[PDB]
Design a protein around this ligand. Structure first.
Ligand SMILES: Nc1ncnc2c1ncn2[C@@H]1O[C@H](CSCC[C@H](N)C(=O)O)[C@@H](O)[C@H]1O
Length: 214
């Protein structure tokens, strides 16, 4: 109910706790990594954006010319727009309410697609895991039962990438590893170009660099 702000690379990002997925903490890993391995990209998209701590920080550090944001939760889309307006970022940001890419403008393609998705397949996750989040966080924040959100995403993302565009997801060692996603990446016509464990103090997390296969 109450709106807070947290500075994400100069952007005052508006959020509510129950929409917070950790992007203002371990999502901070994104700026140094993207700045070393990609430099500034013209068109960046943050999937599963929520309040877009990650996106706004990439924008705020001048790692993208345009930043676009999309999430399935309409409350997330609206809090994200609020942040656009309160930071005067209207000319450089677009927010889309969509389940993965189902209702994202059909023309839209990106050079880099980042994202802090629901991290855990609650079907197979350890009991101790699921219970820690069932009592703390809305199910939309953490739960990808049978990895189905991931599967729709990877199946759709091929046609959403500009020539030479890549995907760079931030995942959780506790709930997955690269091999878990390899079959759905290969099926979709993509490949794992790299796995980069995040450095301390976010080494619970790793980046997955995916891109269309040869
Ligand atoms: N099918 C789907 N399509 C788009 N977004 C989805 C989705 N399923 C879940 N999400 C969103 O994905 C986010 C994962 S939690 C991550 C929140 C935010 N990016 C942060 O770093 O804090 C949630 O906001 C959830 O609403």
């Amino acid at each position: 109910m109450t709106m807070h702000t947290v500075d994400c690379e100069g952007v005052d990002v508006r959020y509510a706790d129950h929409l917070d997925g950790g992007g203002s903490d371990f999502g901070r890993a994104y700026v140094p990594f993207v700045a070393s391995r990609f430099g500034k990209v013209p068109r960046l998209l943050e999937w599963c954006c929520g309040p877009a701590f990650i996106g706004f920080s990439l924008l705020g550090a001048d790692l993208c010319e345009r930043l676009e944001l999309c999430d399935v939760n309409e409350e997330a889309v609206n809090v994200a727009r609020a942040t656009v307006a309160a930071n005067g970022l209207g000319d450089r940001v677009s927010v889309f309410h969509s389940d993965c890419f189902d209702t994202v403008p059909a023309d839209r393609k990106w050079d880099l697609i980042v994202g802090n998705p629901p991290h855990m397949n609650v079907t197979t996750a350890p009991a101790e895991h699921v219970e820690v989040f069932r009592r703390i966080k809305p199910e939309l924040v953490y739960a990808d039962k049978d990895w189905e959100i991931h599967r729709r995403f990877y199946d759709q993302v091929g046609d959403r990438l500009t020539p030479g565009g890549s995907v760079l997801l931030q995942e959780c060692w506790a709930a997955s590893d690269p091999e878990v996603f390899r079959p759905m990446i290969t099926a979709a016509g993509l490949e794992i170009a790299g796995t980069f464990p995040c450095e301390p103090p976010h080494d619970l997390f790793y980046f997955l660099w995916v891109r269309p296969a040869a």
